[PDB]
């Protein structure tokens, strides 16, 4: 008959004095102990409903999709995106951009490469680079970002960038820094007190600046595309958008605007790059800490694929152990622990509570990924979490790192293909080493907010043979 129960708030501060210094997620997990799976937290001036566990999350996103499919704000990036692009759009804008993005992220036209082939080619470029790396120590972040960025680039720009391109690397650095700043303790505080903190210097201003710098490239690329556009033969996603723009130009309210073009494109690149690369970063740190897992994956690669033939998506069904390892990397790395904020679009009943229209909702994906009923000892890295007694792949409904329902990650298929192909192609060709003994490796995230970000680390890729 009212909102879900929760800690008693104070005017101005909301529930600040009841929060945990370790961050938002820890805070909400402490509230879950007391209130259960459905509760309200006042983040500064705003009530936010938290939903925990796969049952509550699925009930909201799947069974009640007519109410829970709205997109909420991330305070650190809202001043930039301002509801433009598919991630941060609502209503008809979202309908149009989602439909457009889904179609263009999968259909490239006659005589164009499949997603699979794009990844396989990028994987071969990566192996070549790693061979030329001379077994040197590196932080692999730049390469994990390059390979994933290049998949999106091939779709959006119709090209890839070279690993040596300093201007490409500058953009990748901006994505990396931005994701870290957003996920920082300041970024989390801003979620509570943006109304006040927006008047002062801080990370929010650096985030704005970083994003506009990336956007500057996108805008210029759009103009280059427009100058060379052949309506009979669109080259890429940008061309296809420009054609819709032309078609709808007599409509002043067309969603196919330049602001949607720039910011949808930026949205796709940001999500397409930072998600998969961060997962890869964690994945290889985990392989350094658990070398027996990496050794067992390599044995499976040897037995199924061999040393020379490039891995392909068809190999997945015959590689239950490798698939389990990747599932477990995703489960353990818990990329977006609180997902991306939703908003309720209409007055709704949920488990006896009344949630008014326009009430922000966080689906705490982390609580599903760490559910001890689905994953025994969920705090530990263990590929057996995704294997049955016979060593066959055991998929589970608790595995929801891409979320669920209408807003489900539109890049899920691309991401899974990237994870499998890049992971297997690297391990086929290289073993890993570092100066830190497995027992000494610390998996504690460098940042844990909107994103869970692994610590920096050094690694060697040693050619096999
Ligand atoms: C390991 C990799 C990835 C993970 C864990 C992940 C996870 C997520 C999550 C949790 C959401 C929020 C869904 C919600 O609102 O409930 C999301 C949304 C989104 N993702 Fe991903 N994602 C990944 C890779 C990608 C890739 C490679 C792309 C680009 C092709 C992408 C594009 C998007 C877009 C455009 C949205 C916004 C969807 C919408 O609001 O309609 N993601 N993703
Ligand atoms: O349009 C005006 C602006 O242009 C010049 O900046 C350039 C630099 O000339 C130029 O070197 C540069 O090259 C970037 C190529 C790499 C693109 C990487 C993409 C990866 C995926 C997401 C989009 C970016 O891109 C920037 C934006 O075009 C300038 O740096 C800024 O003065 C100026 O604000
Ligand atoms: O819609 C597909 C989604 O549904 C699930 O299978 C539920 O477990 C998720 O793993 C997947 O992301
Ligand atoms: C979908 C997303 C993945 C990571 C961060 C939040 C969005 C982003 C702002 C691109």
Please tell me the residue having the least CA distance from ligand 3 atom 11.
400
Which domains, from first to last, does the chain contain? Answer: 1-465 (1.10.630.10)
Contact 368, 325 (CB under 8 A): no
Residues 6+ apart with CB under 8 A from 127: 425, 426, 429, 430
Among all bound ligands, the one having the nearest atom to the CA of 331 is 1
Q: Are 413 and 423 in contact (CB under 8 A)?
A: no
DSSP assignment of 197-233 equals HTTS-SHHHHHHHHHHHHHHHHHHHHHHHHHS--TTS
- 409 assigned ligand-binding residue: yes
**Residues in contact with ligand 1 (CB, 6 Å cut-off):** 71, 86-87, 98, 105, 267-268, 271-272, 275-276, 279, 335-336, 339-340, 401-403, 407-411, 414-415
E strand or H helix at 94 = helix 91-104
Q: Which protein residue's CA is at the shortest distance from atom 30 of ligand 1?
A: 411
Smallest CA separation from ligand 4 atom 7, residue:
271
> Whose CA is closest to atom 1 on ligand 4?
271
Structure's resolution in angstroms:
2.0
> Which experiment gave this structure?
X-ray
The rounded Å distance from CA 129 to ligand 1 centre is 28
Task: Output b/e per residue, 390-406; b: 16+ Cβ within 10 A.
Answer: eeebbebebbbbbbbbb
Instruction: For residue 20, report the distance from its CA to the centre of ligand 3, in Å.
Output: 31
348-350 vs 342-343, strand pairing mode: unpaired
Pocket test residue of 108, 264, 402 for ligand 1, highest count of atoms within 8 A of CB: 402
Question: Would the CB of 386 count as within 6 Å of ligand 3?
Answer: no
User: Cα separation of 376 and 379, whole Å?
Assistant: 9
Give the angle 273-275-278 at the CA atoms, nearest 5°: 100
Beta-strand relationship, 447-448 and 452-453: antiparallel
Q: How many CA atoms lie within 13 A of 299 on its CB side?
A: 8
Residues in Cβ contact with 10 at an 8 Å cutoff, skipping those fewer than 6 apart: 16, 17
Distances 285 to 58, 114, 355, 436 between C-alpha atoms, Å: 31, 30, 42, 11
Question: Is the four-CA dihedral 215, 216, 222, 225 of positive or negative sign?
Answer: negative
Whole-Å CA distances, 465 to 270, 321, 429, 430: 37, 23, 9, 9
């Amino acid at each position: 008959g009212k909102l879900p129960p929760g800690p008693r708030p104070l005017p101005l501060l909301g529930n600040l004095l009841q929060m945990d210094r370790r961050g938002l997620l820890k805070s909400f997990l402490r509230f879950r102990e007391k209130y259960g799976d459905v509760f309200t937290v006042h983040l500064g001036p705003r009530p936010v409903v938290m939903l925990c566990g796969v049952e509550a999350i699925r009930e909201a996103l799947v069974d009640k999709a007519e109410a829970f499919s709205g997109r909420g704000k991330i305070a650190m990036v809202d001043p930039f995106f301002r509801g433009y692009g598919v991630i941060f759009a609502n209503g008809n804008r979202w309908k149009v951009l989602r439909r457009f993005s889904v179609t263009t992220m999968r259909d490239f036209g006659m005589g164009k490469r499949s997603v699979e082939e794009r990844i396989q080619e990028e994987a071969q470029c990566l192996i070549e680079e790693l061979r030329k790396s001379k077994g040197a120590l590196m932080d692999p972040t730049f390469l994990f970002q390059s390979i994933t960025a290049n998949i999106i680039c091939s779709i959006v720009f119709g090209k890839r960038f070279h690993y040596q391109d300093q201007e490409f690397l500058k953009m990748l650095n901006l994505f990396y820094q931005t994701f870290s700043l957003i996920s920082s303790v300041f970024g989390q505080l801003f979620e509570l007190f943006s109304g006040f903190l927006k008047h002062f210097p801080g990370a929010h201003r650096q985030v704005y600046k970083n994003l506009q710098e990336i956007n500057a490239y996108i805008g210029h690329s759009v103009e280059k595309h427009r100058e060379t556009l052949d309506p009979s033969a669109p080259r890429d996603l940008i061309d296809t958008y420009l054609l819709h723009m032309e078609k709808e130009k007599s409509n002043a309210h067309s969603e196919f605007s330049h602001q949607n073009l720039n910011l949808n494109t930026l949205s796709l690149f940001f999500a397409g790059t930072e998600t998969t690369s961060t997962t890869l970063r964690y994945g290889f740190l985990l392989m350094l800490k658990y070398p027996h897992v990496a050794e067992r994956v390599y044995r499976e690669i040897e037995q199924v694929i061999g040393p020379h033939r490039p891995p392909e998506l068809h190999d997945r069904a015959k590689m239950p152990y490798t698939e389990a390892v990747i599932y477990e990397i995703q489960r353990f790395s818990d990329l977006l622990p609180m997902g991306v904020p939703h908003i309720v679009t209409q007055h709704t009943s949920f488990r006896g509570y009344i949630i008014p229209k326009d009430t922000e909702v966080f689906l705490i994906l982390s609580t599903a990924l760490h559910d001890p009923h689905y994953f025994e000892k969920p705090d530990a890295f263990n590929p057996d979490h995704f294997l049955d007694a016979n060593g066959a792949l055991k998929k589970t409904e608790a595995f929801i790192p891409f979320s669920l329902g209408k807003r489900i990650c539109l890049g899920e298929g691309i991401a899974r293909a990237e994870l499998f192909l890049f992971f297997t192609t690297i391990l086929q060709n290289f073993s890993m080493a570092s100066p830190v003994a497995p027992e000494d490796i610390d998996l504690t995230p460098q940042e844990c907010g909107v994103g869970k970000i692994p610590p920096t680390y050094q690694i060697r890729f040693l050619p096999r043979h």
